[PDB]
Write a protein that binds this ligand. Structure first.
Ligand SMILES: Nc1ncnc2c1nc(Br)n2[C@@H]1O[C@H](CO)[C@@H](O)[C@H]1O
Ligand SMILES: [Mg+2]
Length: 390
């Protein structure tokens, strides 16, 4: 008759991390990779013997900075001369070259100098997400929905499809990240009448606010705003500067010139930052941090909140701007949706909830998984081929 169809997958192809889900048995399963991680770093590393993707690439970045590529999404579908590209290049340890006004990343790989287009690096990340899904399903996967930022233009959307095609995926559709987060909560299944939804997306390096209107399951992007210089890495930087000062006070030593010590400090700071989202204090314990000195200290959630206070408050400026652009008042927003790991920060949640006069925030779907969750829901809908009954 008709052989059973393979499940289609939903992929959130993120700037820093990617996530894959599948809708089966009336529910979404966010698929962990083989290191048990529900999100996979959007990193690709090159050596004389291997190409590493995901956790394996990110875990060896310290000693291979020139040949470990990350942030390809910031280059995808852009011209080499684009001012965004020119500024971003100063922060990256890997080489970005100009090939006919199109950026390419250039690395040492298997004994040669090789250059890749951003879509080729993204296809490597998509190949890892496809393999993660196939390890769980136990069969080859063909169909996928891939998400993009709402502000992506035609060139950026086509380059994302091209990345999916290089990876051997059939791209069912390119959908906006804020739309996918709304779909995850079933905000397009509430019936007739207009609903205004605000998506608050705080990432590792950027912050995006989107206002959508949903009428009879139809989405319209009403306004987008944000801050390209606001993310999780900025909170990590504030903790780094704080502990560098603390080591200076306590041991009369400036550690800031030993890259290993600074890196070990930053790694510890990011974990302490995560602990502070669930606990009112967190310990920091580093052995032989600098000059054989053990650094055993702590930080309260109140001190961390004070350290990043201006940064957390600045998330409300793009919210007010988006509301002005959508020509809406805060009471007119029906639903608030949180996206990004940085939204687990209690103070960030409290500031936004206080701004919307005590309103509940939708945060029941892990914010670092909501986009892939919605993409997986849509992928299952898009492959249906029901023939009507008489
Ligand atoms: N529980 C959490 N509390 C605070 N922050 C978090 C948490 N989980 C994640 Br994930 N993050 C941060 O989200 C960003 C994703 O690129 C990184 O900056 C992570 O540090
Ligand atoms: Mg995202």
């Amino acid at each position: 008759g008709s052989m059973a169809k393979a499940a289609a997958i939903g992929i959130d192809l993120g700037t820093t991390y990617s996530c894959v889900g599948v809708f089966q048995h009336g529910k979404v399963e966010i698929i962990a990779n083989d290191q048990g991680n529900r999100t996979t770093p959007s990193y690709v590393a090159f050596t004389d013997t291997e190409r590493l993707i995901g956790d394996a690439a990110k875990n060896q970045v310290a000693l291979n900075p020139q040949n470990t590529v990350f942030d390809a999404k910031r280059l995808i579908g852009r011209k080499f001369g684009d001012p965004v590209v020119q500024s971003d290049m100063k922060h990256w340890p890997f080489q970005v070259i100009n090939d006919g006004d199109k950026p390419k990343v250039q690395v040492s790989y298997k004994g040669e100098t090789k250059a890749f287009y951003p879509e080729e690096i993204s296809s490597m990340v998509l190949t890892k997400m496809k393999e993660i899904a196939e390890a769980y399903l136990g069969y080859p996967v063909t169909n996928a929905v891939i998400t993009v930022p709402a502000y992506f233009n035609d060139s950026q959307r086509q380059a994302t499809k091209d990345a999916g095609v290089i990876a051997g995926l059939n791209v069912l559709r390119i959908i906006n990240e804020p739309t996918a987060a709304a779909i995850a909560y079933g905000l397009d299944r509430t019936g007739k009448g207009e609903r205004n939804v605000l998506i608050f997306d705080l990432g590792g390096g950027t912050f995006d606010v989107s206002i959508l209107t949903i009428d009879d399951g139809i989405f319209e992007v009403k306004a987008t705003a944000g801050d390209t210089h606001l993310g999780g890495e900025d909170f990590d930087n504030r903790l780094v500067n704080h502990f560098v000062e603390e080591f200076k006070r306590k041991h009369k030593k400036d550690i800031s010139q030993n890259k290993r010590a600074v890196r070990r400090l930053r790694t510890a700071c990011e974990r302490a930052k995560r602990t502070l989202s669930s606990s009112t204090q967190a310990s920091l314990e580093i052995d032989s941090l600098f000059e054989g000195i053990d650094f055993y200290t702590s930080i309260t959630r109140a001190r961390f909140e004070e350290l990043c206070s201006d940064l957390f408050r600045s998330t409300l400026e793009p919210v007010e701007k988006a509301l002005r652009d959508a020509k809406l008042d805060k009471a007119q927003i029906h639903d608030l949706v949180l996206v990004g790991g940085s939204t687990r920060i209690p103070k960030v949640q409290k500031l936004l909830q206080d701004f919307f006069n005590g309103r509940d925030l939708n945060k029941s779907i892990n914010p670092d998984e909501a986009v892939a969750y919605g993409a997986a829901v849509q992928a299952a809908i898009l492959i249906k081929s029901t023939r009507a009954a008489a």
